[PDB]
Structure formats: structure tokens, C-alpha cells
Design a protein around this ligand. Structure first.
Ligand SMILES: [Br-]
Ligand SMILES: [Br-]
Ligand SMILES: [Br-]
Ligand SMILES: [Br-]
Ligand SMILES: [Br-]
Ligand SMILES: [Br-]
Ligand SMILES: [Br-]
Ligand SMILES: [Br-]
Ligand SMILES: [Br-]
Length: 283
């Protein structure tokens, strides 16, 4: 009809864990986001958490700028009372059902967006418990997975593969929870995932896992599963192609423009994990 591209699904990842901006680059990223968002970033204690939060902010603005063609300096993002980032309804937007979601853990921040399908995303890093054993960890987490889920988790011989499968199952549940907006009080026991296939190759995307909610198959929901590296798993939930693209900082800054003057108090104000011994959690 018009001489115009059409938005498709977006699947982006950014390794904030390996991102080492110069001072100028960090302070420019800080200028390029909304003031109240910069304020949130300033609240973080550790550099790695600020970096991850920043990444998510830049990916969203990049998404909106480049896929909805809203000038960067005109993008108006907001948060639900529950805290979820959303695009202002006052549009410049031909996609009513446009939506996005973001997540971060370990070394990665990730974004999923869709023109029409409702979307949720969660990423998790497999790592050995900060305190206690793996069986002790499964016991703490026991109430959140069903009998069939646990049998599948424990079906493997080594506890690492079990821990890996556990994190996968947990990322699936969070992807759904984040898609529907229910948050913290939602009983995970109500979600039962049938994980297929049992083993995932790094980089590839799988779409065979099914969800049963309150004992009935949710046929209107699909789930895309990707191991982005050997230790990070991403689940994207979708209600009615898909490989993640890893971006760098230049990519995040492609449509960026400063919105606030440079603020040097956003330098030297964060802790770094190199100055502490990593213990009991990851801190
Ligand atoms: Br893209
Ligand atoms: Br922002
Ligand atoms: Br979000
Ligand atoms: Br998250
Ligand atoms: Br969310
Ligand atoms: Br692809
Ligand atoms: Br980078
Ligand atoms: Br300015
Ligand atoms: Br850090």
C-alpha cells in the first residue's frame, strides 16, 4: 500500500557483562535516556547492574526509533504502576498491539518485541548455588514446580544438567508471568511446562515446549527457547525468524541523541565486583 517497511518480531541481546565503555561513552548513554530513568540507574550499587539497566533502556529506544520511526528525542516511555516499561499511547504508532519486554541476568540483557502478539521474555544464567547444595536449592525451590516438572528435572544423572534444566523451567515460567503482567503473587505451581526437546544446541531456537495452566493446555501460547551461550538460557512467551541478534554499544547508539547535559556525578559512583570477594550470593 505505502512505500514502507513493516515491523516483524525482534529478538535482541547485548552482553553488558563484557561491555567496558569509556567514561565518555557511559556518560553519553546516560544523557541519551529519559531523566527519571537516569535517576533509576543512579540508584544501583554495582556497575554491572547499572550497565544492565542502561542496556535495556537503549535497546527499547533503539527498537522504537528504528521500528516505529519515532525520533529518539520524541520517544516517550512510561512505566505501569507495577513498574513495567511501556510506550505512551499518544501514538505516532500504526501498531495498536505493539509491545515489548526485556530481561537481564548474568552477562546479558535481552529484548523481545512484536507488532501484534503479546510477548514476555526472561533470561537466566545457570550457576552453582551461593549457599548450600543443589539438592538443598531444589528443596528451597520445591513449591514452584510440579511433580512432573521435577521428575523431568531430576531425570538426568548429573546434578549440573538438572540445575540447567531447572533454570530453563524457571525461565519459562517467568516469561509467561512477564507476558501477562501478574508479577509477584502468582503461584508458580499453577504453571506446568512440558519441555521439548530435552537438550538444546547453543544459538538455535526451539518452539516445541508447551504450557499447561491449572491443568489445561494453553494452546494459544507458544514458547521460544534459546541458549544464547553455554550458561544463559532465554525463554520468550507469545500469545496470539527467531534467533537472537547480539548487539554492541554502537548498535545501541545508532539512533541515539543526548537529551540531558553531561552529568559527571554518574562517574565513579558505582562499586565493581573486582574489589570484593564473590561469596554467599554473587556478592
Ligand atoms: Br531486527
Ligand atoms: Br529511557
Ligand atoms: Br519491559
Ligand atoms: Br529480568
Ligand atoms: Br516485565
Ligand atoms: Br533468524
Ligand atoms: Br559493546
Ligand atoms: Br543536552
Ligand atoms: Br560490577
Amino acid at each position: 500500500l505505502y512505500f514502507q517497511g513493516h515491523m516483524e518480531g525482534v529478538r535482541w541481546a547485548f552482553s553488558c557483562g563484557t561491555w567496558l565503555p569509556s567514561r565518555a561513552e557511559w556518560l553519553l548513554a546516560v544523557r541519551s535516556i529519559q531523566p527519571e530513568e537516569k535517576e533509576r540507574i543512579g540508584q544501583f550499587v554495582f556497575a554491572r547492574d547499572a550497565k544492565a539497566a542502561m542496556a535495556g533502556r537503549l535497546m527499547i529506544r533503539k527498537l522504537v526509533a528504528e521500528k516505529l520511526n519515532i525520533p529518539w528525542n520524541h520517544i516517550r516511555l512510561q512505566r505501569t504502576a507495577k513498574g513495567k516499561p511501556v510506550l505512551a499511547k499518544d501514538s505516532s504508532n500504526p501498531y495498536p498491539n505493539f509491545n515489548f519486554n526485556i530481561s537481564h541476568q548474568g552477562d546479558y540483557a535481552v529484548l523481545a518485541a512484536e507488532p501484534e502478539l503479546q510477548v514476555g521474555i526472561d533470561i537466566m544464567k545457570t550457576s552453582f548455588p551461593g549457599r548450600g547444595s543443589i539438592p538443598e536449592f531444589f528443596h528451597i525451590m520445591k513449591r514452584k514446580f510440579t511433580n512432573k516438572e521435577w521428575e523431568t528435572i531430576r531425570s538426568f544423572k548429573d546434578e549440573w544438567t538438572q540445575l540447567d534444566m531447572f533454570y530453563r523451567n524457571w525461565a519459562l515460567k517467568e516469561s509467561f508471568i512477564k507476558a501477562i503482567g501478574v508479577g509477584l503473587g502468582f503461584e508458580l505451581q499453577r504453571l506446568e511446562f512440558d519441555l521439548s526437546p530435552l537438550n538444546l544446541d547453543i544459538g538455535q531456537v526451539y518452539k516445541e515446549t508447551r504450557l499447561f495452566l491449572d491443568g489445561e493446555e494453553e494452546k494459544e501460547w507458544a514458547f521460544e527457547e534459546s541458549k544464547i551461550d553455554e550458561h544463559h538460557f532465554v525463554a520468550v512467551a507469545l500469545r496470539k525468524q527467531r534467533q537472537f541478534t547480539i548487539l554492541n554499544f554502537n548498535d545501541l547508539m545508532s539512533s541515539a541523541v543526548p537529551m540531558t547535559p553531561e552529568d559527571p556525578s554518574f562517574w565513579d559512583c558505582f562499586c565493581f565486583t573486582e574489589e570484593i570477594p564473590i561469596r554467599n550470593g554473587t556478592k
